[PDB]
Amino acid sequence: MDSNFLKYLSTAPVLFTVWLSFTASFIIEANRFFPDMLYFPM
Amino acid sequence: AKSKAVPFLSQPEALDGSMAGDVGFDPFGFSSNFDLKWLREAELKHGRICMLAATGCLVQEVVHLPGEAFSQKMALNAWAAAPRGGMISILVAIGLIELISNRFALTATDMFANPNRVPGDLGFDPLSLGGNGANRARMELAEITHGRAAMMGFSGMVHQMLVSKQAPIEQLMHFKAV
């Protein structure tokens, strides 16, 4: 891995997009496998 | 200049054979981006949990506590069938063991603040079996090798229980191909 390419990958827009997509993928897979969670189940 | 485990790659920096189990195996450069003390503490913790976990996955089939709730030979059924308050107590006790055993230094910014704190040295030697100097390096090598083998084995047993819906030993005795 070229260090300049890694430093470019460490910039705010790239990391922002990657982190928000990663978070969205967590929410999407959680709602795919555990849908319709209006509430915390008792 | 080359890694011994992976001969077509250069030797990873900060790896010089000092730690136990060091064969220069770090192709992704984790030790070039993160500190080796945290990585070794994490590796030992994952390995020790997997040692206890593999031993549990083998023992629970043969030996059970009395009661209906502990009679599931397959460990993934024993996760659900065991009483819930007991497992929450287990979670809280593991949290307390983490809290006091690391001496309130629990994070990536305060664990190893004391220069005397050694990776994987929590001070745990209840029967003081480490009171012998020339055994020590071989002991750490054996511990990390048992931990690595236990990690790979416990991963294989859990996902094979997921495939087969069978406890491990009787899965080896009652094998059904996919």
């Binding site: 891995m1 | 080359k2 001969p7 077509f8 790659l9 250069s10 192709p27 992704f28 996919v178």
Partner: protein, 170 residues
């Protein structure tokens, strides 16, 4: 001055003979724009894939494992898509290819040859000259097998026959 293989073409400037098997054949000028280390890694990977593929086309019709049904290799691709063995082979090839990515990154820094994976457990190349010879043999067999695998698969596609039965009649 001129290329050794094609006497009416000029020798490509980046083909100076540092890579074994160089006969100055690059009329499109691929080495003039792209890194030659990447090109040699791609050439050797494609060629080794093709050698294993041609040997598989010969042996896998000569012999078949008892725990698998019998079929042609082109239909075996479609069968092992659905049974799941092809997914296993793709997964393990990808797992090795991650360290292939690391090896290519080491190659791009000039610390690793574009074909050296340091894999010689049977010690077949003792000294330098035999290794140079085996590099020339490997490159020539790589190019030959790259042509031959396309021959095998396209001939199956047209005749609906495997190689050895096409050899017996026409």
């Amino acid at each position: 001055d001129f290329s050794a293989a094609v006497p009416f073409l000029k020798r490509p400037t980046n083909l100076d003979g540092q890579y074994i098997g160089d006969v100055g054949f690059d009329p499109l000028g691929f080495s003039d724009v792209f890194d030659l280390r990447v090109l040699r890694e791609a050439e050797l990977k494609h060629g080794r894939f093709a050698m294993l593929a041609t040997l598989g086309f010969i042996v896998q019709e000569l012999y078949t494992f008892p725990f698998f049904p019998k079929m042609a290799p082109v239909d075996a691709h479609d069968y092992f898509v659905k049974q799941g063995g092809g997914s296993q082979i793709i997964f393990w090839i990808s797992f090795v290819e991650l360290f292939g990515v690391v090896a290519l990154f080491e190659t791009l820094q000039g610390k690793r040859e574009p074909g050296d994976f340091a894999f010689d457990p049977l010690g077949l190349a003792k000294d330098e000259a035999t290794l140079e010879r085996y590099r020339l043999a490997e490159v020539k067999h790589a190019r030959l097998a790259m042509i031959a695998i396309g021959g095998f698969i396209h001939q199956y596609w047209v005749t609906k026959q495997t190689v050895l039965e096409q050899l017996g009649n026409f």
